Design a protein around this ligand. Structure first.
Ligand SMILES: *CC(=O)Nc1ccc(NC(=O)C*)cc1
Lengths: 365, 16
């Protein structure tokens, strides 16, 4: 958003002026691709990855074929490093089964950073809240909605219903059981011994939210970030937001508007609603950068499934792009990425709708 | 309330 083309130009100049002379050769096989890349990369010092890359299985299309293939294999549930933990991806908290998991996550972060450094695209992709963690950005309760609907619904219920008439007795500590461990966690020092009360709702909600992102995955995330930071230091991503970081890694595809429009569903709206006529008119005029940022804001990603918009998936299964009327023309638009849902208030004119979309697309998360 | 609240409180602790 805003000056994004300026943002990446500055980044490409950063990598280019930090490059190193000479090269590193990487020998790999087709069927053993991820064991071999692991051993050849991890044997090299991190700044050696800033040199020219030579992958013998053009002399730069081999590199792209490496970054695509290895991208699929490292995020492939086989070494048990990643768990979908949605439905039909993210770090698996049961990766401790692998005694060397922390070594594999170091490699994965180094590899993701090589892709950015060398301006190559990966065909895998983490969630927006993961990219916010890479950018040291505050994680919100809406990010919670994107990872864990049912955990989100419970915290919302505590937030605006008094839990005294409910009989809720809660404390500032949460268990978690991974591989039959049952590990307690004190949200603060001595937290298991403080009752959650109507005065301290806000904090508890905030601590519970922050704890949910890194449950069973702190060590793994710390290793990923340490390895990444060794190749491309994280402070070079300083001007970017999570939506821009995703595009930089995944690349841009152009959206098929006929395919989008015929696979959209409506709640308390129709194709004959003027707010829908205006909406489809808005996306016909804007850039395709705006279209992709709008797919991000609504579905949670810029990537489109194999099949097009008909195949869109959300939480409990198939979930097509959806628009729903809420509130009044004074409200701002908002979204629920788990449901691929846009909450579009009933604005009064085309211009008001265009101004309020573009604000939500470009300025809010 | 036809045994309300009681079933949500049990559900909220079970989730959290
Ligand atoms: C009827 C009823 O009150 N059920 C109930 C209340 C609370 C809880 N658990 C906690 O408060 C943690 C379970 C069941």
């Amino acid at each position: 958003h805003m000056g994004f083309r300026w943002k990446l130009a500055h980044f490409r100049y950063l990598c280019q002026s930090n490059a190193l002379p000479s090269h590193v050769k990487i020998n790999v096989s087709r069927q053993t691709l991820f064991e071999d890349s692991f051993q050849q990369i991890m044997a090299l010092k991190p700044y050696d990855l800033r040199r020219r890359l030579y992958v013998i299985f053009d002399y730069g299309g081999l590199a792209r074929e490496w970054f695509f293939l290895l991208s699929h294999e490292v995020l492939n549930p086989m070494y048990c490093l990643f768990e979908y933990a949605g439905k039909n991806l993210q770090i698996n908290p049961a990766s401790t089964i692998n005694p060397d998991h922390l070594s594999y996550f170091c490699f994965i972060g180094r590899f993701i950073a090589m892709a950015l450094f060398h301006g190559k695209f990966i065909d895998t992709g983490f969630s927006l809240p993961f990219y916010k963690r890479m950018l040291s950005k505050k994680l919100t309760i809406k990010d919670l909605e994107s990872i864990d609907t049912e955990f989100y619904n419970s915290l919302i219920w505590i937030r605006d219903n008094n839990i005294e008439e409910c009989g809720l007795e809660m404390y500032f500590s949460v268990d978690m059981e991974i591989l039959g461990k049952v590990t307690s966690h004190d949200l603060k020092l001595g937290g298991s011994n403080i009752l959650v009360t109507e005065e301290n709702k806000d904090e508890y909600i905030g601590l519970m939210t922050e704890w949910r992102f890194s449950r069973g995955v702190q060590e793994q995330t710390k290793a990923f970030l340490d390895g990444f930071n060794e190749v491309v230091p994280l402070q070079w991503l300083q001007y970017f937001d999570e939506k821009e970081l995703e595009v930089m890694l995944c690349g841009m595809q152009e959206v098929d508007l006929a395919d989008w429009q015929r696979n959209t569903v409506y709640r308390h709206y129709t194709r004959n609603s003027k707010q829908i006529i205006w909406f489809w008119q808005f996306v016909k005029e804007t850039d395709n950068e705006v279209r992709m940022r709008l797919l991000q804001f609504v579905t949670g990603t810029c990537r489109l499934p194999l099949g097009g918009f008909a195949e869109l998936m959300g939480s409990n299964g198939p979930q097509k792009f959806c628009i729903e009327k809420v509130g009044k023309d004074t409200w701002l638009p908002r979204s629920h990425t788990c449901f691929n849902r846009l909450d579009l208030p009933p604005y009064k004119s085309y211009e008001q709708l265009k101004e309020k979309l573009l604000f939500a697309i470009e300025e809010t998360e | 309330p036809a045994s309300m609240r009681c079933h949500r409180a049990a559900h909220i602790c079970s989730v959290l």
